[PDB]
Amino acid sequence: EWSYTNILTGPETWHEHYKNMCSGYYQSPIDLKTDISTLDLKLKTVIIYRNTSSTETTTIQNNGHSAEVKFPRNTWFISFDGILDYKYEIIQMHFHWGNTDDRGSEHTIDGFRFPLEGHIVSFRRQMYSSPSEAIGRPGGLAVLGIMHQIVESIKYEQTAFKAYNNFSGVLNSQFVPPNNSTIDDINLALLLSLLNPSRYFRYLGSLTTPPCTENVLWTVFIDPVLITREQINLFRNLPYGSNEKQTRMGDNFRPIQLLNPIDTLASRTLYRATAR
Amino acid sequence: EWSYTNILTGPETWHEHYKNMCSGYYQSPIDLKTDISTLDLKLKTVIIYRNTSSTETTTIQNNGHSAEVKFPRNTWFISFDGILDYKYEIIQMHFHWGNTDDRGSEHTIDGFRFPLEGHIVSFRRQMYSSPSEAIGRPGGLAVLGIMHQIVESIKYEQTAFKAYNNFSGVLNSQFVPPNNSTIDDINLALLLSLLNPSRYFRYLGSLTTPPCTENVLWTVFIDPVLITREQINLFRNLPYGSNEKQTRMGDNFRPIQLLNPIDTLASRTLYRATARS
Ligand SMILES: NS(=O)(=O)c1ccc(CCNC(=S)N2CC(=O)N3CCc4ccccc4[C@H]3C2)cc1
Ligand SMILES: NS(=O)(=O)c1ccc(CCNC(=S)N2CC(=O)N3CCc4ccccc4[C@H]3C2)cc1
Ligand SMILES: *[C@@H]1O[C@H](CO)[C@@H](O)[C@H](O)[C@H]1NC(C)=O
Ligand SMILES: *[C@@H]1O[C@H](CO)[C@@H](O)[C@H](O)[C@H]1NC(C)=O
Ligand SMILES: [Zn+2]
Ligand SMILES: [Zn+2]
Numbered sequence A: 001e002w003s004y005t006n007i008l009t010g011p012e013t014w015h016e017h018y019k020n021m022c023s024g025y026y027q028s029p030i031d032l033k034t035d036i037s038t039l040d041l042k043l044k045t046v047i048i049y050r051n052t053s054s055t056e057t058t059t060i061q062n063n064g065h066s067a068e069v070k071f072p073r074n075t076w077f078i079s080f081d082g083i084l085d086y087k088y089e090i091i092q093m094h095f096h097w098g099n100t101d102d103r104g105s106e107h108t109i110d111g112f113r114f115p116l117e118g119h120i121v122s123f124r125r126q127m128y129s130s131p132s133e134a135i136g137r138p139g140g141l142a143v144l145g146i147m148h149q150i151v152e153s154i155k156y157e158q159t160a161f162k163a164y165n166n167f168s169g170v171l172n173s174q175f176v177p178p179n180n181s182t183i184d185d186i187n188l189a190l191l192l193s194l195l196n197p198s199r200y201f202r203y204l205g206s207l208t209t210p211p212c213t214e215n216v217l218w219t220v221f222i223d224p225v226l227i228t229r230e231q232i233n234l235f236r237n238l239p240y241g242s243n244e245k246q247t248r249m250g251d252n253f254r255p256i257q258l259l260n261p262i263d264t265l266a267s268r269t270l271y272r273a274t275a276r
Numbered sequence B: 001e002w003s004y005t006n007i008l009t010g011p012e013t014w015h016e017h018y019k020n021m022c023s024g025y026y027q028s029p030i031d032l033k034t035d036i037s038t039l040d041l042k043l044k045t046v047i048i049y050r051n052t053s054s055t056e057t058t059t060i061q062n063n064g065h066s067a068e069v070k071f072p073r074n075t076w077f078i079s080f081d082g083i084l085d086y087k088y089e090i091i092q093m094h095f096h097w098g099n100t101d102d103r104g105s106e107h108t109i110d111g112f113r114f115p116l117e118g119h120i121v122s123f124r125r126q127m128y129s130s131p132s133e134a135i136g137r138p139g140g141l142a143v144l145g146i147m148h149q150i151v152e153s154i155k156y157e158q159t160a161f162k163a164y165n166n167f168s169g170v171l172n173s174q175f176v177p178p179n180n181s182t183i184d185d186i187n188l189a190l191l192l193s194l195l196n197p198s199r200y201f202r203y204l205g206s207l208t209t210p211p212c213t214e215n216v217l218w219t220v221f222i223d224p225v226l227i228t229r230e231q232i233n234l235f236r237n238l239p240y241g242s243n244e245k246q247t248r249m250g251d252n253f254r255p256i257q258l259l260n261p262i263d264t265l266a267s268r269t270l271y272r273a274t275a276r277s
Helices: A011-017 A165-169 A188-193 A229-236 B011-017 B160-169 B188-193 B229-236
Strands: A047-050 A058-062 A067-070 A076-079 A088-097 A116-124 A141-150 A180-183 A200-205 A216-221 A225-227 A271-273 B047-050 B058-062 B067-070 B076-079 B088-097 B116-123 B141-150 B180-183 B200-205 B216-221 B225-227 B271-273
Touching: A047 A188, A076 A116, A088 A229, A141 A229, A165 A180, B047 B188, B076 B116, B088 B229, B141 B229, B160 B180, B160 B188, B160 B225
Parallel strands: A141 A216, A141 A225, B141 B216, B141 B225
Antiparallel strands: A047 A076, A058 A067, A058 A180, A067 A088, A076 A088, A088 A116, A116 A141, A200 A216, A200 A271, B047 B076, B058 B067, B058 B180, B067 B088, B076 B088, B088 B116, B116 B141, B200 B216, B200 B271
């Protein structure tokens, strides 16, 4: 009972249909404002790393609202502190994009929309033993936002689609909800190497789909990875679920939320990080 | 005399006109081959840092072959080891570009040319007390190569030209050689933050202009910084010097050299770096 493009179930209705927590005042996405952010030199380079003993397969699903890569358990990790001790475990990666190249991202940077934003979703394994235990609990989640920008001149091997192994060619008009397919694994360490993993915005916010749970540690990298126009078009061939009005999947992004709506009882701060 | 576009003085002649050292077997630029390169996990993230006590002015000149930013002494530094103890001191930054958007860089990455390559030139202050001591001596220099790529959709603030402060507007048809102008300082730390400073090729090579001295420790970052078509055409507004056949400055790049020409007496290796995973 939610959508992006059906005005009966669309993002303007979520605050009424999912008051816990889409009516809250720690919502995502936000406009990432360079001038109205606080630099915190203690925020360290982000590392993504794999358990080389893991052999289980990766899948991708058209879930009717996005293309969602589902990682197997105990395989991909994030470190924010330079220690490789499995504090954050990656669950899934999904995508938000536009009907057109001038929009698509959930977050903006100084009001600018990117054509594609990837969300790498992890749970705080340091505290919570499973995703199902973490997803609804305080401080459960950490999401990385990866901006993508379109370029006319580039070798395949230097695009984000190299790190995605082209989603093993699975993206087409017949990849219909709720189908999933097995795909070659995503090299998330290569993906992170395509941008500056020290240069990012950081804040406490929410899931950007219902029920908009206010338990997400957000990190949004300022530098985009690079893709081609042919590559963004592979996402736009996907069909939306039947609860949507638009036929082809696109404009699957939530509208911008305020950092501090007027009813907040404790203001949050937007932080930024850069290298030593 | 040398040039890029006069066939009498152009790059195919340098090996004869400047045999010391344009006839050498450790020449630059090279094709940076991802597959035929040795990953060395010991090569650390590059840092660029400023002496915040320096107040001296930056200038830029059209030297007849490039646009060259001349930094004041004791101002901008490179660290390859995480220590901020002034081992490498930056002297200047210049640029290589194309008549068209599909060429211009001196290095290639797996055969691919970028529209614009910037060269941040430093000397090994750790060993040599001045640029003029280091520039002609063994192991004297370290150059950073910064690839740039054109995007259609971007804010000024996320382009390389934010770090450059648009070179204070000096890139135009009236910026004739050998004119120099005072410019706002270049934020080289911001520039480096626009790419991944842990992801680079590394090798021992040469200056890419005569006399091609084989005393350069090369670092070429794999990820490009971003510019617009409007910004690349600003460089194309500069006039070449009177040594050149072409009027407008462009195609001011040296042809690709082999890592190991047939006559080499000791093969060099191309190294690659990536972030502590
Ligand atoms: N757009 S975003 O990045 O803000 C974002 C929005 C919304 C979500 C949805 C989170 N749900 C997700 S990621 N779910 C649902 C679930 O109940 N379980 C619990 C069961 C289970 C078991 C193994 C592995 C995974 C799971 C997750 C999957 C995640 C991320
Ligand atoms: N294309 S490249 O990156 O391989 C490359 C090619 C050629 C060079 C030019 C080297 N010359 C350069 S960088 N010169 C010449 C000189 O007489 N002195 C000595 C005096 C002096 C004093 C202060 C500050 C600078 C200097 C340099 C400037 C540098 C770099
Ligand atoms: C990527 O996948 C698409 C199908 O989604 C295919 O048409 C395209 O050629 C693929 N490109 C590769 C493997 O480079
Ligand atoms: C920093 O600048 C000051 C004054 O400009 C100078 O005296 C000092 O030597 C510089 N530091 C270094 C390490 O070069
Ligand atoms: Zn998302
Ligand atoms: Zn140069």
